[PDB]
């Protein structure tokens, strides 16, 4: 035949990408475009639903241009997949087709209050009361709290609600509705699953919930899996369905985390991967039946592919402050200069001769959830340096994850079986090194780092036949896209005593109050 | 018709100077030498007893000649006195008049099982056993401690006790010795107060601790005061007795913390100061009669002018990192690049914004005695910048003061009613408005820092009638030498606040083994 493409539309929180891969997986086309972060009072921050939806549609006319010009064999994009910054919610009107308010950024914490009462008022006290159902603690984070605020607070979203004409939607099912003209209203089962509204058992709405929290199920879309065929780009809102040329069909939606999950091959239990950016989010994939947390942690769903296919589950968990101790050592501390420096003083020591440097800027989350512990050093000298405290940061950092999977095993009863990593901090060898030996497993780094993008890609192509099996996209990814490996390399007696060390310091964090 | 001149020797722990006073108490003439500082094993450290002997002469001899220059008529100095860096011991053999090995420093860790061997054997376990008797705990820096190890590890020392040919002393009784052709084995007062072999109150060498640390008497140098004849000058080294002219008599020895006491003017009860430097420590003028101390404070003789004169008692109270502390975060941490940026980022902040660095690299001495206490900082978050934390040291410097004189007031029974500061870290103003600000009294400042130095020539000078009395001298000094006064400046809530931080960080700091 010809050759195929696939289309990763990856809607971040700052900007918006297309990603053209070609059936080598590689990334051939690439357009960025940000989108306006808005502030109206501390602690809130929420996004326009239509400039997000435009700067997709740039970027798939962008891209798709530039492609043209460089590859005479591309002729048309197969499917398109999406991936999105989860929990951020859109209310829009069925007829006018239109946002009825701004959107609520998943860190936006407008909903607290909403958040303090549901505890009290339905959960008698317990975050957790419906955690066997959704998964979830009660938090802002989540999406009904969020789709809450807006039935109490923007007069539109309550009026639409009553004319029967409201949509609440994850970005994913916004950027679907419309790429589609409005006439797909669907969501993705890993997208629910950040809404507090989903059974996790049966991957449907839990009519309780939904009552609980008074969000009717007339405003909700229908939940589908990661990949199979959602709908088609049926706009031309920036020169899309000219530059797209053929109709062309949406076969992918998954949200970011379980996207790089997915992007990185973890399709068996025990495959685990982390993102070092400004945190880290970590995901392990548990098998085909939920896992529930005893020490904090999300159960989610990791992936689905096929409508009604297999449903593989996951654990998630995060650290706060990881790229962001790198950023405050440098611009705060003036430790070095610019992110070259942090990897070579932290290699000019053989390691940290007693002291442990805990980053709780603001708390500990990961399995020991605590929002009085800050940033605390202990153990220097006058033989200490910033070599040394950069390289604490770095096994901090690496302590965290490895308290993180220490939890994941035991909710899981699994052991991890090897550990992907993508973000920027993976570019750092050391820390990569010193999260090896710490794990006792390879740990994995993909050079192609488009991780995120290239899950939902991936689910479009399967969906859509360009790849026919995991197994297929599993051989591909590791012939074509070459992966750089990094096995433990410390003794026992070492990663024993970091991590008695770590310990130890960790009680001498409590101080906010 | 012409100036008088008195000579002081500052024999320091890093090097000596001569300085030449006039009867207006102002240096007109100064040379320094450096001095070798081996440590052949780890915490352990050592000088070269011909080395420092030979740099006290190149002193005298160049400042004579320079003074010679700016004064040609100038044709001798009435009198040398003597200060010297304490504890120090030299072993030496009565008639090769040569060290039989290198001296151990105050703050050599050699004597440590030593140390423990007497608290147990000698001490039934409790550190604190003498304390009545010497004013002193059992440590690693008393002069007896130091005395025993030669004796036990040292052949030629071991040897030369069996003929009766052994001798041993300070640096002030090694110098003067020297000094004397050696006509002279004698020792002060203050000097003497630091070998643990003195009775505090009688200022007589103890029989019954001599006897049980195998110290035999016949190496001991006759105590005498800081004010008397004490021998003459009869070697030419560096030409030295030549460039003196005449026969010059030393009249004036004094350890060099008390040296500073007595050259701050310090002759009341309840006037103290505080030095910084090769290490850092607050004396306190306490009367007449001995106080002794249940909050680790050493109680020790300040000074006695004459045979016959009043021996006014003190207490000591140490800090071990203060002006290391500034060039610590200046050369190990780089938080800044030169000595005058600290005092401006500090002052650029209006405080420590929630945070606590408390700086016991090498463990909590003051009344507090925690050897397992590192450096640790509490308290941060992304807000923290370099400015909190070096305005956070500088707190902490104050706060350790604070808490020294804390309990020097309950032990004494007096106020502070002024504290006098000289070293380095004094020329800092931030530190000492928040010192001030502390102890709620006055800071005074002397423009003629070189005071320690000043304190053995007051001794020389008053022995030879240069100055007749302390009044002459404090009316002298008054009216040559300017100060400087900072008032303190805050609340009782403030101060009250800071103290309370303080003390919560302290439960952190303990660390090693
Ligand atoms: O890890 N984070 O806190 C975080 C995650 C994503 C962010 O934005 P994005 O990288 O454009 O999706 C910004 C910050």
Redesign the pocket.
């Known amino acids: 035949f010809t050759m195929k493409y696939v289309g990763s539309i990856d809607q ?4 918006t990408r297309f990603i053209i891969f070609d059936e080598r997986q590689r990334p051939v086309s690439v357009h960025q475009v940000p989108h306006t972060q808005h502030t109206p009072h501390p602690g809130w921050l929420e996004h326009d639903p239509m400039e997000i939806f435009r700067s997709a549609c740039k970027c798939m006319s962008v891209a798709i241009a530039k492609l043209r010009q460089k590859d005479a064999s591309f002729r048309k994009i197969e499917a398109i997949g999406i991936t999105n ?1 989860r929990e951020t919610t859109v209310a829009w009107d069925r007829v006018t087709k239109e946002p009825l308010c701004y959107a609520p950024v998943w860190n936006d914490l407008r909903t607290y209050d909403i958040t303090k009462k549901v505890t009290a008022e339905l959960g008698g006290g317990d975050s957790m009361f419906a955690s066997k159902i959704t998964g979830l603690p009660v938090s802002t984070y989540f999406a009904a709290f969020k789709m809450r605020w807006m039935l109490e607070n923007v007069p539109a979203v309550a009026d639409a609600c009553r004319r029967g004409t409201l949509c609440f939607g994850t970005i994913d099912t916004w950027l679907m509705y419309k790429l589609s003209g409005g006439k797909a209203f669907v969501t993705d089962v890993t997208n629910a699953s950040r809404t507090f509204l989903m059974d996790l058992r049966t991957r449907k709405w839990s009519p309780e919930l939904c009552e609980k929290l008074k969000i009717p199920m007339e405003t909700l879309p229908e939940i589908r899996s990661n990949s199979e065929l959602f709908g088609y780009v049926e706009t031309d809102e920036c020169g899309v369905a000219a530059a797209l040329n053929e109709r062309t069909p949406i076969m992918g939606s998954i949200g970011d985390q379980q996207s790089a999950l997915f992007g990185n091959m973890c399709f068996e239990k025990g495959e685990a991967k982390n993102t070092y ?3 880290c ?1 970590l995901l392990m994939n548990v098998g085909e039946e939920a896992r529930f947390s005893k020490h904090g942690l999300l159960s989610t769903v990791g992936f689905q592919v096929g409508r009604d296919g297999p449903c593989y589950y996951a654990l998630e968990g995060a650290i706060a402050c990881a790229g962001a101790t790198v950023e405050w050592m440098r611009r705060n501390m003036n430790l070095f200069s610019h992110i070259t420096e942090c990897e070579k003083l932290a290699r000019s020591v053989p390691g940290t001769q007693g002291i442990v440097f805990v980053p709780a800027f603001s708390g500990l989350l990961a399995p020991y959830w605590d929002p009085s512990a800050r940033g605390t050093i202990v153990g220097m000298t006058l033989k200490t340096t910033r070599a040394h405290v950069i390289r604490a940061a770095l096994q901090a950092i690496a302590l965290q994850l490895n308290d993180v999977v220490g939890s994941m095993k035991r909710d899981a009863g699994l052991n991890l079986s090897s550990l992907r990593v993508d973000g920027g901090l993976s570019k750092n060898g050391l820390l990569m090194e010193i999260q090896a030996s710490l794990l006792g497993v390879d740990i994995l780094v993909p050079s192609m780092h488009e991780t995120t993008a290239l899950g939902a890609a991936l689910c479009a192509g399967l969906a859509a036949g360009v790849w026919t099996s995991l197994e297929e996209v599993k051989a591909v990814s590791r012939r074509e896209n070459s992966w750089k490996t990094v096995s433990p390399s410390g003794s026992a007696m070492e990663r024993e005593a970091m991590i008695a060390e770590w310990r130890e310091a960790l009680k001498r964090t409590k101080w906010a109050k």
Chains 1, 2 share one sequence.
């Open positions: 971040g929180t700052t900007s910054q950016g400004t945190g989010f």
